[PDB]
From a paper:
It is conserved in evolution from protozoan parasites through yeasts and plants to animals, and is thus among the small number (<10) of core actin-binding proteins present in all eukaryotes.
The N-terminal HFD domain of CAP is critical for actin filament disassembly in vitro and in cells. Interestingly, the dimeric HFD domain was able to strongly accelerate actin filament depolymerization at much lower concentration when compared to the monomeric HFD domain. These data demonstrate that the HFD domain is the functionally minimal unit for actin filament pointed end depolymerization, and that its oligomerization decreases the effective protein concentration needed for this activity.
Residue numbers in the entry:
A (entry chain D): 29 to 207
B (entry chain A): 37 to 209
Write the structure that this text describes.
């Protein structure tokens, strides 16, 4: 029937593989972000939308021929706007009580842009996760023996990019496999 | 970073209704703010699918459903929020959104997308009329919220009529 509209659909193989690797880190990161609240919670919602746009692009690639140099930026404009949204939130909230949490995310979120690389996407995400780790090391120093929910937040966030590296390694090693 | 023709034409029509809806929802807060963030996410996936349609040759059956699977998940997330928040002080605001959000599913139809979105707008209108009955003469922010939300689907219909009147136009090459 038409009144029901678009029913829930099963994800194709590219996204199924992505979800099996990234579901548990993403869920834990979203749980701990809600527990911390404030700016950490607001930022996680933006990261979660970035991840949802990551899956939408993987689905595109599984059914689409890689377009011309210029024509690809038209496909990546939705994910690059979301990456910038996550970055400008940190830039506008420099007075935040959770600045290092905001910095860990803004300085690593560009990892979602691995889909724009035709060579070495894995080392790119490793370098992004090294930047997240610098700021998360500060969160650990401040909260390791004060608030354990911040310690799990750090571990949960960093494993998103560790699990993204495992996904790229298994399926898209030499770059996102376009149709 | 810069948007393609399909999405730029969408933004020309939907940027101001969407912004107004998000600002009013934040003013109301609570469950209305929570729901609007889910609607904004759905609208972002809509744009992503319009960018896919501009550069991609139309897929058949299962290949097409694989493309639509991200947005279908988000539409359902908007719908399950209302079904799980029946004890809400903003139940009609919640109902207005969940009974109309399937308008984002127009991208799946092979014919007549406008009357489909119109029917979703009729459902939004039934419940927004209950928000108006209740909150006009109480708080005019709810009146501005209704006007903002209904105009999203009014401007969507103008986008469909102008560019994708017989169905979503996919790339021919």
């Amino acid at each position: 029937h038409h009144s029901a509209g678009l029913e829930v659909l099963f994800q194709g193989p590219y996204v199924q593989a992505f979800d099996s690797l990234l579901a548990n880190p993403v869920a834990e990161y979203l749980k701990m972000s809600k527990e911390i609240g404030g700016d950490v919670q607001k930022h996680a919602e933006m990261v979660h939308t970035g991840l949802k746009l990551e899956r939408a692009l993987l689905a595109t690639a599984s059914q689409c021929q890689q377009p011309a140099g210029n024509k690809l930026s038209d496909l990546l404009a939705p994910i690059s706007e979301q990456i910038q949204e996550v970055i400008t939130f940190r830039e506008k909230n420099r007075g935040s009580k959770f600045f290092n949490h905001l910095s860990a995310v803004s300085e690593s979120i560009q990892a979602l842009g691995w889909v724009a690389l035709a060579a070495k996407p894995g080392p790119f995400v490793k370098e992004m996760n090294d930047a997240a780790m610098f700021y998360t090391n500060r969160v650990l120093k401040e909260y390791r023996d004060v608030d354990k929910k911040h310690v799990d937040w750090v571990r949960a966030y960093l494993s998103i990019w560790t699990e993204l590296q495992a996904y790229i390694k298994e399926f898209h090693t030499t770059g996102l496999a376009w149709s």
